[PDB]
From Swiss-Prot, chain B:
Keyword set, alphabetical order: Acetylation, Calcium, Cell projection, Cilium, Cytoplasm, Cytoskeleton, Disease variant, Flagellum, Host-virus interaction, Isopeptide bond, Long QT syndrome, Metal-binding, Methylation, Phosphoprotein, Repeat, Ubl conjugation
Extra remark: This protein has four functional calcium-binding sites.
Species annotation: Homo sapiens (Human)
Modified residue annotations for Phosphoserine: S77, S97
Protein name, as recorded: Calmodulin-1
Acetylation among keywords: yes
Length: 62, 143
């Protein structure tokens, strides 16, 4: 319950924060030297998928 | 519904390396590792299984479109995020301490960075007791 709850909050916030192009959430991708537009797009897809996974896992535990 | 399709098709094509119109765990994992992530096979399978609507283990373009069109801020998600916060609100007063919130956000689950949590808290509007009203967070993320 607790890990599932934490992960839903965190993935939800990472999706929300990725809408703001100057959010600090963009600074975590340290493998990438310069964040390009096509990186931002793929990151947004991955984050949306991670949120939907976290939503399902919380619905199971709740 | 318009030129969004060309964008989604461009996005889809980034993941589908071999061009067969289908995204596997292996290809999803390739894109994530190139971003410096290190997903397990279990995490890759959960991500596919959430998008894979016909249960054949891979993602075709229509299934990708369905997920890209899914509503993220609807009433059902709002209530689920609110109940996730309520897990850390034992007394049910609608408030979480800023200290408990930062520890949960940084040390459990996905483990946000300190700078990320700083950004969360800055938007949180703390009261004068170190308490965060998390219903404001929920509303802020779903507006
Ligand atoms: Ca493929
Ligand atoms: Ca499929």
């Amino acid at each position: 319950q607790i890990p599932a709850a934490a992960s839903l909050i965190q993935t939800a916030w990472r999706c929300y924060a990725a809408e703001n192009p100057d959010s600090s959430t963009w600074k975590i991708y340290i493998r990438i030297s310069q964040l390009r537009e096509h990186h931002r797009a793929t990151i947004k897809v991955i984050r949306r998928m991670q949120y939907f996974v976290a939503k399902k896992k919380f619905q199971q535990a709740r | 519904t318009e030129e969004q399709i060309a964008e989604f098709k461009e996005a889809f094509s980034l993941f589908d390396k071999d061009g067969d119109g289908t995204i596997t765990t292996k290809e999803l994992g390739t894109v994530m590792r190139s971003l410096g992530q290190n997903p397990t096979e279990a995490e890759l399978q959960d991500m596919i299984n959430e998008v894979d609507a016909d249960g054949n283990g891979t993602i075709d373009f229509p299934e990708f479109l369905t997920m890209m069109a899914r509503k993220m801020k609807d009433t059902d998600s709002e209530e689920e995020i609110r109940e996730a916060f309520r897990v850390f609100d034992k007394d049910g007063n609608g408030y979480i301490s800023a200290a408990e919130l930062r520890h949960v956000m940084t040390n459990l689950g996905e483990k946000l960075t300190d700078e990320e949590v700083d950004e969360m808290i800055r938007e949180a509007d703390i009261d004068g007791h170190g308490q965060v009203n998390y219903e404001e967070f929920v509303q802020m993320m779903t507006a």
